[PDB]
């Protein structure tokens, strides 16, 4: 008799088509199970259907959920309180918006264990909970507001909230998606060691497949609502059966990072000792603080090649992306292209003759490409600020670029609303190479995409170079998707270069600490 025996299920959202269409899973009352699935596949909705937190339109229309014999598919709002906190726990996804921003975190943790009445012994246990969940200084960190903690501490506190009543089953609804890998490993290694001595079961809901196989014990794969394959973990990665699992394991960067990666003097970009110095007026208006976002970086970028810049948040890799494009003023550096960038050329005459040979590609597809346009008027724009002939030229070109980024060529009146981001990024790529530049600056252009959509954009940029002879400056936040494309790696920490060498002297023999833990932090 398992501790969770869901079989048959359907969750319709307001007389629309169903989101879940027949899922069936079971937790063996002490084991670890993963609910691997692509985005929008109804993998998290399922969780929200087990607890009862179906948002504002949901309703179970088939099957039944049975937690340890007693059926609970009937959400008896009064009976659910004997099960909601003390027998089934829930760890949310977003760390910033899952805490009331007007209550100290200590109050929110001491109100989550309060079944017995006391004021002093409960504020002396909501601190021990935060101390055992793992937290630098649980004395004063429990006296701050949810907006003064930093990313990983909010999640380390959400875990303590979730494990307050000693549940028999935890539901970790994608707990470490929005965290950088360095703490995305520590938080998971601590959770899987905390729920290992309490006997608690665990139900990961991830979007990776090589992560679950490292953590979980039984993996279940979901597509569009239906379970596709489910078996032992260490036999679902090395011997898949369903074609979906095949194209899901052959598109993970954790395999292909061990490939052959088949491939005029060069040295176009030459950076030397860039520096940016930010001052903040926090507190008194005359006690300004000193902070270096970018501190003495220097490199040289050879033509017809690639160079990836990595580093977690607060590494100034996004500020360095602006100082190169000319969208931000440096302090003590030069980024001279050949004779460009303020020395002889980019003074008043090459302020436009430079924009037509260096163009950026931004991070999320939904911000760029303003709503009140069409796919045509968005690609035609960089030909309208410069000058090219009208309908003969300006129409023939746009419907030829569309064919290079492999778009149906019938999406020329669609506003960016009905575009299903992932092919909305193929429009930001086509707009970039409209004037045939020779440098692209991909500022995490592919970080915010699905697992299968991301594998195609990297495979599209890699052959959009072998023909045009482009020259990329890729900017990522993890060593995972590099081995495929990049030929040279630069690592940054706290805004200062750490190691710089080829992508083989870094993926097989690194000579630094902080870049040797970025290797042992990928799900491999």
């Amino acid at each position: 008799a398992p501790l969770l025996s869901v079989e048959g299920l359907e969750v319709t959202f307001g007389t629309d088509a169903p989101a879940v269409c027949g899922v069936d899973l079971a937790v063996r009352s002490g084991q670890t199970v993963a609910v691997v699935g692509e985005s929008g596949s109804g993998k998290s909705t399922t969780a929200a259907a087990i607890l009862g937190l179906l948002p504002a339109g949901g309703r179970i229309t088939a099957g039944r959920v049975v937690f340890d014999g007693r059926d609970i598919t009937g959400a008896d709002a009064k009976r659910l309180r004997s099960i909601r906190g003390r027998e089934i726990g829930y760890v949310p996804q977003d760390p910033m918006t899952n805490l009331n921003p007007v209550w100290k975190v200590g109050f929110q943790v001491t109100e989550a264990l309060r079944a017995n009445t006391d004021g002093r012994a409960a504020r002396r246990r909501a601190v021990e909970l935060l101390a055992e969940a793992g937290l630098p200084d649980p004395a004063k960190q429990a006296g701050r507001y949810p907006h003064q903690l930093s990313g990983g501490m909010c999640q380390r506190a959400l875990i303590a909230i979730g494990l307050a009543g000693r549940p028999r089953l935890l539901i970790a609804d994608e707990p470490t998606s929005a965290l950088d890998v360095t703490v995305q490993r520590q938080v998971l290694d601590h959770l899987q060691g905390l729920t290992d001595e309490l006997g608690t079961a665990l139900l990961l809901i991830t979007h990776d497949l090589a992560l679950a196989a490292q953590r979980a014990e039984a993996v279940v794969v979901v597509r569009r609502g239906v379970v596709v394959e489910s078996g032992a973990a260490q036999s679902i990665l090395q011997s898949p059966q369903h074609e979906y699992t095949r194209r899901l394991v052959a598109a993970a960067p954790s395999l292909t990072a061990r490939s052959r990666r088949p491939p005029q003097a060069g040295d176009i970009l030459v950076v030397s000792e860039l520096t940016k110095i930010y001052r903040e007026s926090r507190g008194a208006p005359w006690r300004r603080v000193e902070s270096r976002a970018v501190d003495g970086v220097s490199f040289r970028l050879p033509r017809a090649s690639t160079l990836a810049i990595v580093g977690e948040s607060g590494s100034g890799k996004s500020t360095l992306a602006r100082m190169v494009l000319g969208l931000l003023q440096p302090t003590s550096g030069t980024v001279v292209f050949d004779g460009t960038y303020d020395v002889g050329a980019l003074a008043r005459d090459q302020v436009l003759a430079f924009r037509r040979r260096v163009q950026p590609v931004f991070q999320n597809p939904y911000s760029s490409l303003d709503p009140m346009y069409s796919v045509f008027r968005a690609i035609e724009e960089p030909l309208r600020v410069h000058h090219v002939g009208d309908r003969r030229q300006r129409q023939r070109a746009v419907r030829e670029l569309v064919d290079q980024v492999a778009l149906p060529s019938s999406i020329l009146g669609r506003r960016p609303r009905e575009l299903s981001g992932g092919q909305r990024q193929r429009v930001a790529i086509a707009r970039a190479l409209a004037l045939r530049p020779e440098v692209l600056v991909c500022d995490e252009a592919v970080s915010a995409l699905d697992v299968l959509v991301q594998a195609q954009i990297l495979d599209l940029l890699a052959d959009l170079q072998a023909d045009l002879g482009l020259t990329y400056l890729f900017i990522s936040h993890d060593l995972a998707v590099i081995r495929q494309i990049a030929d040279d790696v630069l690592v940054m920490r706290a805004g200062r270069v750490v190691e710089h060498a080829s992508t083989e002297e870094v993926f097989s023999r690194p000579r630094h600490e902080y870049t040797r833990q970025l290797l042992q932090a990928i799900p491999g």
Binding site: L51, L53, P55, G85, D94, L99, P101, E111, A112, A284
Partner: protein, 298 residues
């Protein structure tokens, strides 16, 4: 919080120094000569110190040292205001105990039970109460209650206890009761679907606790801010409300000064109401900063 008020008052200072300029400008610059637009008062007052700046300086010094001017009844404005403030204060306590009790008690229900007949009805009634102007609503209420179904007095008239000051209060509060019922409803209905609410209800504690410590605590801040900022329209409505009910408050004094065309005693009262409004704006911002820690540390 300590370094927030030091920036709030420093921002208030130019607003005061600039709002006094507009009043003195509308006093001094007019089509030809305000001395004829507003005789021994032309040499003693306005001693013809043509360097406008120093005249403004002396004017501000007089305003500071308790000297406001002279009312149309021969008494200094200080005396008439100190004699007529208690009545308008007791009138403004009503219409603020109405718009904050009934308004909030209806908005909370219409938000928690949104999409229903009650919600539709309260929204369509709030949208109607704003349409009706203040003066016609006041006179209709006065007729229907005082004259026809004799319950309330027709006019208060210098005997103003909370007993017979209850109909003018309701009339003055029904306007802006249709705002504190359409704002709190839209706040609650959108705050009851947040993420921290789901995380708080997914850890045991019962429904009353959720509603009172996670929804209302977070959604009652804009309501308080709007109640603080509504004083500017409450002042304007008090004039028309104390005109037809014959109440001897600041509104009634200003109504008489407007009716009898006594121009030197309207500016002397409005230059006090403006300062009071600025003070209450600052004192409401100092509470909005204490109820939300994201601006306190911002």
């Amino acid at each position: 919080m300590g370094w927030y008020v030091a920036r709030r008052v420093a921002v208030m200072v130019p607003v005061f120094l600039g709002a006094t300029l507009l009043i003195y400008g509308m006093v001094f610059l007019l089509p030809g000569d305000p001395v004829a637009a507003l005789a021994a008062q032309l040499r003693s007052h306005y001693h013809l110190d043509d360097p406008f700046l120093v005249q403004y300086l002396r004017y501000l010094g007089g305003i500071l040292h308790g000297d406001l001017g002279r009312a149309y009844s021969g008494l200094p404005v200080s005396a008439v205001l100190a004699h007529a403030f208690p009545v308008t204060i007791r009138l403004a306590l009503i219409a603020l105990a109405v718009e904050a009790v009934l308004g909030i008690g209806f908005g909370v229900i219409a938000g928690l039970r949104q999409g229903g007949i009650f919600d539709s009805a309260v929204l369509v009634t709030g949208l109607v109460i704003i349409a009706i102007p203040i003066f016609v609503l006041g006179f209709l209420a006065q007729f229907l209650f005082g004259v026809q179904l004799e319950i309330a007095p027709v006019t208060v008239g210098e005997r103003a206890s909370v007993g017979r000051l209850l109909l003018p209060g309701i009339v003055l509060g029904a306007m802006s009761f249709a705002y504190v019922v359409r704002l709190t409803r839209s706040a609650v209905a959108a705050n009851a679907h947040a993420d921290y609410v789901r995380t708080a209800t997914a850890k045991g504690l019962s429904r009353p606790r959720v509603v009172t410590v996670h929804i209302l605590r977070n959604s009652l801040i804009p309501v308080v801010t709007f109640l603080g900022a509504d004083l500017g329209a409450l002042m304007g409505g008090a004039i028309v409300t104390e005109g037809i009910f014959n109440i001897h408050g600041v509104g009634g004094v200003l109504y008489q000064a407007v009716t009898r065309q006594e121009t030197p005693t309207v500016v002397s009262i409005v230059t006090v109401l403006v300062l009071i409004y600025l003070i209450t704006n600052l004192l409401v911002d100092l509470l909005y900063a204490a109820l939300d820690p994201r601006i306190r540390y911002g």
